[PDB]
Design a protein around this ligand. Structure first.
Ligand SMILES: CCN(CC)CCNC(=O)c1c(C)[nH]c(/C=C2\C(=O)Nc3ccc(F)cc32)c1C
Length: 99
């Protein structure tokens, strides 16, 4: 466990606490969200981010934040504003930017 890995695992744990039901914690399927794989060119989720930490693909907190922002932007693009997914993506994007 390197310092960067420890730091990012801490950040990821705090972010996921804002998503207790795992809206953003798994690879979305077209069966769940028809059209998703065509609309969202660069999908991202917390499970994939955890794997990228372990593979040590993040060389910076800025890279980690880029993936988090991507995850949130994707959810706010596919889902209409009056949905639980858009609303939670917006709230955790803002709260993640704090830390
Ligand atoms: C007929 C469909 N109805 C009109 C929209 C509502 C039904 N909607 C549903 O069932 C549904 C469910 C149960 N999950 C999602 C989508 C996502 C999810 O869970 N995590 C995500 C993360 C990113 C993202 F971009 C989409 C999702 C939908 C659309």
């Amino acid at each position: 466990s390197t310092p960067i890995q420890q730091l990012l695992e801490h950040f990821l744990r705090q972010l996921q606490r804002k998503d207790p039901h795992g809206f953003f914690a798994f690879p979305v399927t077209d069966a769940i969200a028809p059209g998703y794989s065509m609309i969202i060119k660069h999908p991202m989720d917390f499970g994939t981010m955890k794997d990228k930490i372990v593979a040590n693909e993040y060389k910076s907190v800025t890279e980690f934040k880029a993936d988090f922002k991507l995850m949130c932007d994707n959810a706010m693009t596919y889902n209409r504003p009056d949905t639980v997914y858009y609303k939670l993506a917006k709230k955790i994007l803002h709260a993640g930017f704090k830390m």
